[PDB]
Design a protein around this ligand. Structure first.
Ligand code: HEM
Ligand SMILES: [N+]
Length: 184
């Protein structure tokens, strides 16, 4: 179960965050033990497509090779806080699992600048018991977390030392698919 009401960044700049470009997860913190593997790869694109606020996701388990993409229209709860009903798609946007009630994630941007961000997400998917997940993002897939975002982790009363890095997993991403999925 999720337990955190994450606070969105004061003065969050939505148009800059949702500019159509890609964000890579560089580090993550799952609050519930064993909710996720200790080696993982994830990235997203975020943008407005034909007037609609969208995110495209990519997940890859570098050990098992499990791979999946998603696309969602985000609904607004407040500035920087969204609810996203997701559909599983192949890389070309063909639907594998349709949107359905009870399949949604929340998404809160706690900190962002042009190059880095800190987000919280809570996944709801059928009768799974999933918990809070924080992620440090960067525009550059190889970037070590800088002082702005690490200070934001501290300001959220979290310990960056607990976050797990994705950088040692040989992660390679299809940025073209993520961008094009925004339209799907
Ligand atoms: C931007 C950050 C993230 C968002 C918005 C997000 C969202 C989601 C969504 C929507 C699903 C379900 C997809 C589907 O069934 O179609 C999912 C599944 C999953 N995510 Fe993430 N995720 C993010 C990052 C991560 C990270 C960093 C990990 C670390 C391992 C992770 C681990 C998983 C796992 C293991 C599943 C499979 C759950 C299951 O069905 O048992 N995610 N995520
Ligand atoms: N997740």
């Amino acid at each position: 179960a999720c337990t955190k009401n994450a606070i969105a960044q004061t003065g969050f700049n939505k148009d800059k965050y949702f500019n159509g470009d890609v964000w890579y997860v560089t580090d993550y913190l799952n609050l519930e033990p064993d909710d996720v593997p200790k080696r993982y790869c994830a990235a997203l694109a975020a943008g407005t497509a034909s007037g609609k606020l969208k995110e495209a996701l990519y997940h890859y388990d570098p050990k098992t090779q499990d791979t999946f993409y998603d696309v969602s229209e985000l609904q607004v709860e407040s500035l920087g806080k969204y609810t996203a009903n997701f559909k599983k798609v192949d890389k070309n946007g063909n639907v594998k699992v349709a949107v359905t009630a009870g399949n949604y994630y929340t998404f809160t941007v706690m900190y962002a600048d042009d190059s880095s961000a800190l987000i919280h997400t809570c996944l709801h998917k059928g009768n799974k018991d999933l918990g809070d997940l924080y992620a440090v993002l960067n525009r550059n897939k190889d970037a070590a977390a800088g002082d702005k975002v690490k200070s934001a982790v501290s300001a959220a009363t979290l310990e960056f030392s607990k976050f797990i890095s994705t950088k040692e997993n040989n992660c390679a991403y299809d940025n073209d698919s993520l961008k094009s999925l925004l339209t799907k």
